[PDB]
């Protein structure tokens, strides 16, 4: 309790201890509101041990009454001392007094960093957010908001949507719409322009949002040179230094290139794909990550000639039964796979036409595991062979922020690095799921612990995911193989079923391709250890179930729940075929 | 325990008490399997009080060992007596010996009745399912499977889908597809033909399914004349009588007509809509149920001129804030509403063209609450002014099955009517949510209690729903107004937010129309009392959350869960604006 309280007092920029039923508190609140002074507030009457807290406060203030106002680790006064400060118009300089230029500097203006920034400023923390987008080899760059906004989830899903509309056009005819499909084509550059216009509205909405929370935004490359000092290089190359109490590292990752001749010069990554000025044309995706398969899938649904070169397996780290079903759907729907194949070199045959927005032309040479040569021409070659942080570009090694062997930041469960005022969130936080909503929740929850005395940690267990392949794949919890490894085969029951979306019946799409399973623990009341679903809208299906699983759902909790009919998701409420039973999951 | 056991013994058609680790049991199992004798099995080693049960069994068998086999309330033997019966080829006549023609007669071959039938036969119950479809006034009729399959959820959602594809065609252009929309039209009869072909495959799949579980299917009108006697009229008018141990009434409801001149002669209901041989054309829907709005919505999205005549409010019994938002979306997207208006008469101006499949033409006369006359021409007039059971057509009043004032069957929480061998499931069970998955779960769970010694009851609390209006509306739990009425305003907190599907950004659809809220109980740890969402795929969104709510989810359980990005459903995991705060839910 006093451990909690001295952390809180030391860390908050401007915090008020208070009670709901306290008119002097309210008059402090109103004076600060009226003064445009943002602050955290702890209502001691709403905590089970507010009494203990009010008492231990005397260790900081020499008093035990509410209101108590602190600034940057130091008691400032009760009601009368605040009004004294206000009426003398000394309050501004009081609440702005700091050893440092800022209470918080965020390095990286992405998902985690913007969320942490905004939330901190809400409680009075003087905040600066730094963001700079180092260009890709071909010079692609973009605005504020990080990987998801600009070159990730947002444009990725929009282009997935454009792909799904392909199949909407096909389905439309069976549902009675008179459509001349022989005279329908897709225009890559019209789609990119719409995608990029929505992104620009996000770049701009984030700038505006920072402005509206009095966050300082610096489009500058940050480098942490000591615990509290960040050296910024601006657009001009002008160098300067700013100081901050807390530092949040939220710099994300960038795509890796394979170390082969031609890769950097002639290939592209997802960084370039989503603003590509020309239709990629006949495309080779090298990789097997969810990024690789997502991109191949939508390019193929847009009518493209698409090949995916796979070294070993699809979606390493995901349930491999589900990965195979993902892959099988894509193969039967236009995506070619060069299985057990690696690339040796990219040779240029045509340069990109900057004039007519046409792709160039490339010769990809590689080899299969069976010794046969791979040699084929593609207009575009995309690498999706993983991503890596670039922290030597951000961290003077002298500061003492410890990195792991992969270059990610080693953190405690409250995101603290080995430099105690420096935290790391998002993709660079070693061992955490690399997902936008995780980074947002981490940054916001961290900001609350730093600046408003919260204690809640981010829960990184059982974080649900969706892969937006042509047929989508959502999961929450363990893969079937990881559950068996953890608990043993004898203790695992798997219930499963195929299903067919009603939307697919009249459209003449496949029976017994969509599929779901619950991976359960026999010895723990058939606890649901992992949920897996392959089918349309798989993220909408999966999300709600993640709440139940977080609460410890069992098979019996699924069974008790009544279905919504007609939906895909309702099939989770009637599963009865187990894998051990050997009975077929088909319907 | 002995109460449970004598119910079980009396009711099961063919049940075996047993243990997993019992070779004589297995040899009984295998002889019966080999004999094609279906039966229930209770493994006493898997119940906490299997010991007490094995003991109390001596009250029925004079023995205390496993295996113990019963038929229709009477001990039949241990291992040796069964093999004795088998080897003498007396076992068939033993397990077929019954006071009654059937162990179970289901009256009504719909959602509940087919599910109860199939599940009962699984455990050896000799089962007959009766179904007959009394024609609509214009002579429409259909095949096996009940209201949902033929004239409800299935064709309703398929035509909703055909409507959604309309908006897919519009969206397609913004996502880059070159589409001449000025030359696209919808063909009603092509859609109906696809819809009806899928229905026929369900009619046929249900027949096949009954055949494969040795259920007898009689396309005959059933009438219960005494507790155990059903009088059947067949296609021919040939009358006969069959007897059954247990009777399940699962006869559903039929559409009501308003008592006004012309309604029966010239209007139609949903019963007729889904196989209508002609495009309805300019249509008037009289009503404000979810059926009324669902039908108006898809007709309008198919290009139709659609008017809905509303007496008072939309969707009485649903959250009225959500109903208004549903209605507002439809008004801004092509549906006209004649508010506070009732019909007085339907006059015919043109007869339906049976030849060219063109609608007729009707004059609808009515009056508004303000005294102004309503008079307008429509090609089709649909009544969706509620539904009612027709039990006098099924129940000789002499049998003693008690009905309520609305003609529905008064039941205990195990679906038992006031005639103890007669149960009621589905829409005719008074006070229960009238939904297909409820009826399926009730029928299956009931069948298990009757014929395999199960005890689990159906849980009718917090049953989630989705209304498939043009913008869909899913709910689970209480409306905001019912929660306030139950607990009082002071004890209710409502968190809410607008949201925008990512799919809508590039498509230029509305900000701040989709919407969700959690209705919570302050004094019970912010327990989620009701969840409400308006937006695409609202049934996929809502379903998973119904499991969490069944488990007692609180706001904190929602907050702890990490979102899947990008999805609509993820917004439930980050809600923070309360209604009391007066802060706007817009984003
Ligand atoms: C193709 C692709 C698709 C994806 N799809 C999804 C999805 O569908 N759902 C999901 O949840 N996640 C998805 N992700 C992951 C998601 O993008 C990341 O989890 C998220 O963007 C990372 O948040 P972050 O804050 O860690 O880093 P980022 O979002 O990458 O932000 C880091 C920012 O800091 C900048 N920066 C780097 N160094 C400096 C420096 N010295 N000074 C100043 N600024 C610097 C970076 O240029 C960047 O702008 C996808 C990723 C990719 C590559
Ligand atoms: C337009 C409409 C849309 C709907 N959409 C949905 C939805 O989207 N999701 C959902 O969950 N629910 C929906 N419903 C409700 C759903 O249809 C019902 O809950 C379900 O069909 C009722 O199941 P049941 O077994 O009670 O009766 P029914 O399905 O109606 O089956 C009763 C059967 O018994 C027959 N019968 C009647 N009398 C006799 C007799 N004497 N002898 C023999 N047979 C007889 C009947 O003709 C019928 O075939 C919808 C209903 C309507 C009208
Ligand atoms: C296992 C696979 C599959 O099923 C389909 C495609 C594929 C491609 C590359 C590697 C493996 C697979
Ligand atoms: C409250 C309504 C609304 O918002 C829109 C349409 C409507 C139609 C009939 C009755 C009420 C409404
Ligand atoms: K269920
Ligand atoms: K959350």
PDB file of C-alpha atoms in Angstrom, chain B residues 104-123 125 127-129 210 213 215 247-250 423-426 439-448 450-451:
ATOM      1  CA  UNK B 104     -42.536 -40.922 -28.839  1.00  0.00           C
ATOM      2  CA  UNK B 105     -44.908 -39.219 -31.208  1.00  0.00           C
ATOM      3  CA  UNK B 106     -43.924 -35.664 -32.213  1.00  0.00           C
ATOM      4  CA  UNK B 107     -46.756 -33.577 -33.554  1.00  0.00           C
ATOM      5  CA  UNK B 108     -45.169 -30.927 -35.761  1.00  0.00           C
ATOM      6  CA  UNK B 109     -42.146 -31.454 -38.010  1.00  0.00           C
ATOM      7  CA  UNK B 110     -40.440 -28.124 -37.400  1.00  0.00           C
ATOM      8  CA  UNK B 111     -37.269 -26.931 -35.693  1.00  0.00           C
ATOM      9  CA  UNK B 112     -38.145 -28.252 -32.232  1.00  0.00           C
ATOM     10  CA  UNK B 113     -40.013 -31.357 -33.325  1.00  0.00           C
ATOM     11  CA  UNK B 114     -37.428 -32.678 -35.790  1.00  0.00           C
ATOM     12  CA  UNK B 115     -34.649 -32.092 -33.288  1.00  0.00           C
ATOM     13  CA  UNK B 116     -36.524 -33.836 -30.463  1.00  0.00           C
ATOM     14  CA  UNK B 117     -37.502 -36.703 -32.785  1.00  0.00           C
ATOM     15  CA  UNK B 118     -33.970 -37.389 -34.064  1.00  0.00           C
ATOM     16  CA  UNK B 119     -32.359 -37.169 -30.648  1.00  0.00           C
ATOM     17  CA  UNK B 120     -34.892 -39.518 -29.038  1.00  0.00           C
ATOM     18  CA  UNK B 121     -34.495 -42.204 -31.705  1.00  0.00           C
ATOM     19  CA  UNK B 122     -30.768 -42.126 -31.006  1.00  0.00           C
ATOM     20  CA  UNK B 123     -31.449 -43.790 -27.627  1.00  0.00           C
ATOM     21  CA  UNK B 125     -37.075 -44.594 -28.664  1.00  0.00           C
ATOM     22  CA  UNK B 127     -40.332 -42.403 -32.853  1.00  0.00           C
ATOM     23  CA  UNK B 128     -42.866 -41.012 -35.282  1.00  0.00           C
ATOM     24  CA  UNK B 129     -42.874 -37.403 -36.484  1.00  0.00           C
ATOM     25  CA  UNK B 210     -35.464 -39.200 -40.309  1.00  0.00           C
ATOM     26  CA  UNK B 213     -32.472 -42.597 -37.601  1.00  0.00           C
ATOM     27  CA  UNK B 215     -37.885 -42.356 -37.366  1.00  0.00           C
ATOM     28  CA  UNK B 247     -46.124 -36.984 -26.854  1.00  0.00           C
ATOM     29  CA  UNK B 248     -44.258 -33.803 -27.868  1.00  0.00           C
ATOM     30  CA  UNK B 249     -46.365 -30.955 -29.160  1.00  0.00           C
ATOM     31  CA  UNK B 250     -44.235 -28.858 -31.514  1.00  0.00           C
ATOM     32  CA  UNK B 423     -44.656 -31.963 -23.470  1.00  0.00           C
ATOM     33  CA  UNK B 424     -44.595 -28.749 -25.543  1.00  0.00           C
ATOM     34  CA  UNK B 425     -41.589 -27.095 -27.126  1.00  0.00           C
ATOM     35  CA  UNK B 426     -40.934 -24.177 -29.412  1.00  0.00           C
ATOM     36  CA  UNK B 439     -36.719 -24.911 -29.845  1.00  0.00           C
ATOM     37  CA  UNK B 440     -33.855 -27.145 -31.025  1.00  0.00           C
ATOM     38  CA  UNK B 441     -32.102 -27.008 -27.661  1.00  0.00           C
ATOM     39  CA  UNK B 442     -35.400 -27.613 -25.820  1.00  0.00           C
ATOM     40  CA  UNK B 443     -36.356 -30.590 -27.977  1.00  0.00           C
ATOM     41  CA  UNK B 444     -32.926 -32.222 -27.767  1.00  0.00           C
ATOM     42  CA  UNK B 445     -32.498 -31.649 -24.033  1.00  0.00           C
ATOM     43  CA  UNK B 446     -36.048 -32.859 -23.378  1.00  0.00           C
ATOM     44  CA  UNK B 447     -35.402 -35.980 -25.470  1.00  0.00           C
ATOM     45  CA  UNK B 448     -32.356 -36.708 -23.354  1.00  0.00           C
ATOM     46  CA  UNK B 450     -37.011 -38.647 -21.383  1.00  0.00           C
ATOM     47  CA  UNK B 451     -34.940 -41.382 -22.891  1.00  0.00           C
TER      48      UNK B 451
END
